[PDB]
Scaffold this active site. Structure first.
Site, PDB file in Angstrom:
ATOM      1  N   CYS B  65      43.492  44.545  52.861  1.00  0.00           N
ATOM      2  CA  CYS B  65      42.393  44.991  51.963  1.00  0.00           C
ATOM      3  C   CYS B  65      42.596  46.392  51.303  1.00  0.00           C
ATOM      4  CB  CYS B  65      41.042  45.051  52.710  1.00  0.00           C
ATOM      5  SG  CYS B  65      39.614  45.500  51.672  1.00  0.00           S
ATOM      6  N   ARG B  68      39.246  49.059  51.465  1.00  0.00           N
ATOM      7  CA  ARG B  68      38.789  49.756  52.649  1.00  0.00           C
ATOM      8  C   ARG B  68      38.250  51.210  52.497  1.00  0.00           C
ATOM      9  NH1 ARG B  68      43.765  49.115  56.491  1.00  0.00           N
ATOM     10  NH2 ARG B  68      44.939  48.730  54.530  1.00  0.00           N
ATOM     11  N   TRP B 237      32.608  43.250  46.847  1.00  0.00           N
ATOM     12  CA  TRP B 237      32.667  42.808  45.466  1.00  0.00           C
ATOM     13  C   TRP B 237      34.077  42.490  45.100  1.00  0.00           C
ATOM     14  CZ3 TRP B 237      30.709  47.731  46.649  1.00  0.00           C
ATOM     15  CH2 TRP B 237      31.637  48.746  46.516  1.00  0.00           C
ATOM     16  N   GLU B 242      41.691  39.329  40.988  1.00  0.00           N
ATOM     17  CA  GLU B 242      41.616  38.158  41.848  1.00  0.00           C
ATOM     18  C   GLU B 242      41.040  36.955  41.144  1.00  0.00           C
ATOM     19  OE1 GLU B 242      43.055  38.216  44.577  1.00  0.00           O
ATOM     20  OE2 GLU B 242      42.074  36.899  46.068  1.00  0.00           O
TER      21      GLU B 242
HETATM   22  C1  HEM Z   1      33.930  46.200  48.580  1.00  0.00           C
HETATM   23  C2  HEM Z   1      34.855  45.525  47.843  1.00  0.00           C
HETATM   24  C3  HEM Z   1      36.091  44.817  48.407  1.00  0.00           C
HETATM   25  C4  HEM Z   1      37.152  44.657  47.626  1.00  0.00           C
HETATM   26  C5  HEM Z   1      37.107  45.053  46.165  1.00  0.00           C
HETATM   27  C6  HEM Z   1      38.158  44.090  48.394  1.00  0.00           C
HETATM   28  C7  HEM Z   1      39.377  43.735  47.863  1.00  0.00           C
HETATM   29  C8  HEM Z   1      40.254  42.921  48.588  1.00  0.00           C
HETATM   30  C9  HEM Z   1      41.359  42.248  47.985  1.00  0.00           C
HETATM   31  C10 HEM Z   1      41.721  42.355  46.508  1.00  0.00           C
HETATM   32  C11 HEM Z   1      42.040  41.585  48.935  1.00  0.00           C
HETATM   33  C12 HEM Z   1      43.275  40.726  48.669  1.00  0.00           C
HETATM   34  C13 HEM Z   1      42.936  39.293  49.042  1.00  0.00           C
HETATM   35  C14 HEM Z   1      43.572  38.227  48.207  1.00  0.00           C
HETATM   36  O1  HEM Z   1      44.606  38.503  47.513  1.00  0.00           O
HETATM   37  O2  HEM Z   1      43.024  37.070  48.289  1.00  0.00           O
HETATM   38  C15 HEM Z   1      41.315  41.795  50.118  1.00  0.00           C
HETATM   39  C16 HEM Z   1      41.659  41.229  51.287  1.00  0.00           C
HETATM   40  C17 HEM Z   1      40.881  41.391  52.400  1.00  0.00           C
HETATM   41  N1  HEM Z   1      39.767  42.166  52.538  1.00  0.00           N
HETATM   42 FE1  HEM Z   1      38.873  43.132  51.217  1.00  0.00          FE
HETATM   43  N2  HEM Z   1      37.746  43.857  49.645  1.00  0.00           N
HETATM   44  C18 HEM Z   1      36.495  44.355  49.734  1.00  0.00           C
HETATM   45  C19 HEM Z   1      35.668  44.300  50.847  1.00  0.00           C
HETATM   46  C20 HEM Z   1      36.040  43.775  52.085  1.00  0.00           C
HETATM   47  C21 HEM Z   1      35.200  43.679  53.158  1.00  0.00           C
HETATM   48  C22 HEM Z   1      33.735  44.064  53.138  1.00  0.00           C
HETATM   49  C23 HEM Z   1      35.940  43.257  54.237  1.00  0.00           C
HETATM   50  C24 HEM Z   1      35.459  42.986  55.595  1.00  0.00           C
HETATM   51  C25 HEM Z   1      34.268  43.360  56.013  1.00  0.00           C
HETATM   52  C26 HEM Z   1      37.272  43.074  53.803  1.00  0.00           C
HETATM   53  C27 HEM Z   1      38.289  42.536  54.515  1.00  0.00           C
HETATM   54  C28 HEM Z   1      39.402  42.015  53.841  1.00  0.00           C
HETATM   55  C29 HEM Z   1      40.342  41.120  54.553  1.00  0.00           C
HETATM   56  C30 HEM Z   1      40.313  40.712  56.025  1.00  0.00           C
HETATM   57  C31 HEM Z   1      41.285  40.761  53.651  1.00  0.00           C
HETATM   58  C32 HEM Z   1      42.447  39.793  53.900  1.00  0.00           C
HETATM   59  C33 HEM Z   1      41.827  38.364  53.709  1.00  0.00           C
HETATM   60  C34 HEM Z   1      42.842  37.226  53.755  1.00  0.00           C
HETATM   61  O3  HEM Z   1      43.686  37.107  54.650  1.00  0.00           O
HETATM   62  O4  HEM Z   1      42.877  36.382  52.849  1.00  0.00           O
HETATM   63  N3  HEM Z   1      37.339  43.507  52.529  1.00  0.00           N
HETATM   64  N4  HEM Z   1      40.278  42.707  49.936  1.00  0.00           N
HETATM   65  O1  LIG Z   2      37.788  41.429  45.604  1.00  0.00           O
HETATM   66  N1  LIG Z   2      38.688  40.695  45.960  1.00  0.00           N
HETATM   67  O2  LIG Z   2      39.669  40.250  45.063  1.00  0.00           O
HETATM   68  C1  LIG Z   2      38.645  40.219  47.236  1.00  0.00           C
HETATM   69  C2  LIG Z   2      39.604  39.416  47.804  1.00  0.00           C
HETATM   70  C3  LIG Z   2      39.448  38.953  49.110  1.00  0.00           C
HETATM   71  C4  LIG Z   2      38.342  39.267  49.891  1.00  0.00           C
HETATM   72  C5  LIG Z   2      37.351  40.040  49.330  1.00  0.00           C
HETATM   73  C6  LIG Z   2      36.060  40.558  49.752  1.00  0.00           C
HETATM   74 BR1  LIG Z   2      35.348  40.142  51.515  1.00  0.00          BR
HETATM   75  N2  LIG Z   2      35.487  41.314  48.844  1.00  0.00           N
HETATM   76  N3  LIG Z   2      36.363  41.293  47.764  1.00  0.00           N
HETATM   77  C7  LIG Z   2      37.449  40.563  47.988  1.00  0.00           C
HETATM   78 CL   LIG Z   3      38.299  34.458  45.394  1.00  0.00          CL
END
Ligand code: HEM
Ligand SMILES: O=[N+]([O-])c1cccc2c(Br)n[nH]c12
Ligand SMILES: [Cl-]
Ligand code: HEM
Ligand SMILES: O=[N+]([O-])c1cccc2c(Br)n[nH]c12
Ligand SMILES: [Cl-]
Lengths: 362, 362
Positions: B65, B68, B237, B242
């Site tokens: 992520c 974070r 969000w 994505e």
């Molecule tokens: C607030 C805005 C957030 C954004 C913009 C964001 C953005 C992202 C993005 C772009 C990825 C790449 C995933 C992909 O390529 O499918 C990701 C993965 C991930 N995020 Fe976030 N995220 C956010 C919030 C969160 C939250 C709230 C959590 C947990 C409470 C979290 C946990 C993760 C995890 C575990 C992954 C890996 C998921 C997987 O294996 O497919 N993130 N995040």
């Molecule tokens: O924003 N993203 O492209 C994205 C990808 C994968 C997981 C999450 C979450 Br939970 N919030 N945003 C995400």
């Molecule tokens: Cl998605």
């Protein structure tokens, strides 16, 4: 121990190389011969065939190269005979000329004499044979930052750049026994260069970008059956993205995107306009078009990646394990539009191969 | 052994969590208490404070992520009380509503009851709470391929999609003791959706793209001090890329680039035109603009990466080791225009954390 590592690399190497060349019966004897030669001399000498094919294998095992489909057609030039600096310079000039081939670029490698007791016969200082000088004189940046340290080394030694943004660095290398390297100005007739123009947007020339035609990595070591060819410069042609996305775009190199942006008539104020993405695409388009317009060989990253997929099918169809460093294979633009992105690669080192070595300046 | 792994995860977890919360003296006693509870029950129950903060840590240790920076403001909803399917459905509906917040999206996590002897109390089948159905009926592809298998599972069970390209999947989950899951149609008033329009190119609406506002990952397990919350859906969000670069672009998902290309008035015949790059940029621009125009929260990848750089400074300034999976952090477009690209990250697993688990359909 030295003998032993050398001896083992050699056994592994010969068996595999002769196997590939359908020469499996000749192995016992060739190894026997080598066992004697290392017994006596503490080293051994490659046949022409072994050396050609080793260099081919080394490219094939280069995990970070996307263009390995063409490994077997590498043009190998064997200059293990050179003893003088004039011959080295002249071997270098020749490689530039023969690899350039009037713009129809031939993948070529010139192999100089190996290390002795790890004692270098020749030590090439350039990173690439053709590369632009970098200056930095109290926060006035000129040319290519990446070349700052080498450039101040040449300047130490007598060279003086014109301080253009594209000053050609001289060739500079050192011969065993000399405490200083020599340098030699690059003849201009040797170096093809391309101006960057856009197919659609004429103001694009206002930027006055250009780049050299052929990338020739001149500071990596080639290892083959325990033999360390520290000076064995090699080339392919360019994938556009390396020029248009790294060399011209990175902040630490030419840093052109704002200017790109201004001249393509978009604003560079808001990240949400994706003005870096958009500039990067027009700039990478300008690059391919100019090289194709000039009759200079180049590949776009999509084409390259379809080539690299054939390479993958071919390894497996040949019964060979594939290796690859995903982090380098993916292109720096639109990587998810290539299949490389959606799979994983085993990043182990298989020899023969190309390796980094310490810079002697710095 | 079960007791022992649980007991150790717990020791590690409490010490670190209470340390972070300035509650270090209270640790001996809290552990003693837990030692008894696991002695007796074979498990232990988190305090509200421990659970809030565990979930925060789990986001903070999510190597993949980029977003974070905002880990500490995660909204944590503790629904360990739910016993009935009506309460689960209703907890789910609530999370959608409270996380959406009329488009000003709040990072939220609803935590249901943990596993018992690794026996699941609730098993959520959706991948995301809001997601579009996928069909494939003899080489007629409809909606989202990624959802094909789940979709045919719902259809098994009674649900019937309208076979639009954006049919909303129902919520579907299973309760301990039931041999089948239930499903419940998503109320439409709950789901914000955005039409994709370009800021400049009006024919862009002809594509009739839309996407949902909030991504809510509903099939990963949260582990905290040895406790396995298999059902603990979470959201942030979207980063634009994505939607615009994966969901809409990949060949295996919506596969829109040709159409993008056609409607933006460029030809899709030659790789050297960089028509996928160019379409990808107009499409990603269309995405940010539409979400910002609609009052729905979104981040572009440049902004996101500057946020993630603050996260990196802050870990180190807090004395915390940083972890990260480079292959996921880099964005799928213009990755070399972000600093993420030019550095490396340690991909170790630190708990608490989110983890994959087996799908129950398939
Ligand atoms: C607030 C805005 C957030 C954004 C913009 C964001 C953005 C992202 C993005 C772009 C990825 C790449 C995933 C992909 O390529 O499918 C990701 C993965 C991930 N995020 Fe976030 N995220 C956010 C919030 C969160 C939250 C709230 C959590 C947990 C409470 C979290 C946990 C993760 C995890 C575990 C992954 C890996 C998921 C997987 O294996 O497919 N993130 N995040
Ligand atoms: O924003 N993203 O492209 C994205 C990808 C994968 C997981 C999450 C979450 Br939970 N919030 N945003 C995400
Ligand atoms: Cl998605
Ligand atoms: C024929 C056209 C060639 C193309 C288009 C090509 C393309 C590339 C590209 C794009 C990279 C990534 C490097 C970077 O990001 O700086 C690369 C790396 C590399 N290629 Fe090739 N290459 C070609 C020929 C060669 C040849 C002929 C060799 C050796 C004989 C070779 C060996 C390597 C090695 C060792 C690397 C990693 C270099 C490093 O560490 O910086 N490739 N290749
Ligand atoms: O084309 N490239 O972008 C590229 C990068 C690095 C090394 C080489 C060689 Br040797 N040929 N082409 C290269
Ligand atoms: Cl280069």
């Amino acid at each position: 121990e030295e003998k032993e590592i050398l001896w083992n690399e050699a056994k592994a190497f010969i068996a595999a190389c002769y196997q590939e060349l359908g020469k499996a019966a000749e192995v016992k004897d060739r190894l026997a011969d080598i066992k004697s030669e290392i017994d006596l001399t503490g080293s051994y000498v490659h046949t022409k065939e072994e050396l050609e094919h080793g260099a081919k294998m080394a490219w094939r095992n280069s995990n970070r190269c996307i263009g390995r489909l063409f490994w077997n057609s590498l043009n190998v030039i064997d200059r293990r005979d050179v003893r003088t600096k004039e011959e080295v310079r002249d071997a270098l000039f020749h490689h530039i000329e023969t690899a350039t081939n009037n713009g129809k670029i031939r993948p070529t490698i010139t192999i100089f004499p190996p290390e002795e007791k790890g004692e270098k016969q020749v030590e090439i200082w350039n990173h690439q044979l053709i590369r632009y000088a970098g200056y930095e004189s109290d926060g006035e940046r000129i040319g290519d930052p990446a070349s700052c340290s080498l450039t101040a080394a040449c300047e130490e030694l007598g060279w003086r750049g014109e301080r253009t943004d594209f000053d050609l660095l001289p060739l500079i290398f050192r011969m065993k026994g000399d405490e200083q390297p020599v340098w030699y100005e690059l003849p201009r007739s040797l170096v093809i260069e391309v101006p960057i123009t856009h197919p659609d947007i004429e103001a694009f020339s206002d930027l006055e970008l250009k780049w050299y035609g052929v990338p020739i990595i001149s500071d990596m070591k080639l290892e083959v059956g325990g033999i360390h060819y520290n000076a064995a410069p090699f080339n392919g042609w360019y994938m556009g993205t390396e020029i248009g996305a790294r060399n011209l775009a990175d902040e630490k190199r030419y840093d052109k995107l704002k200017k790109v942006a201004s001249v393509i008539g978009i604003a560079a104020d808001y990240n949400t306009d994706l003005w870096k993405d958009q500039a990067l695409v027009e700039l990478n388009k300008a690059v391919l078009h100019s090289y194709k317009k000039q009759g200079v060989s180049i590949v776009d990253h999509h084409t390259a990646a379809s080539q690299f997929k054939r390479f993958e099918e071919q390894a497996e169809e040949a019964g060979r394990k594939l290796t690859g460093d995903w982090t380098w294979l993916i292109p720096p633009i639109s990587p998810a539009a290539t299949h490389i992105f959606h799979r994983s690669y085993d990043n182990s080192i298989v020899k023969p191969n190309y390796f980094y070595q310490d810079k002697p300046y710095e």
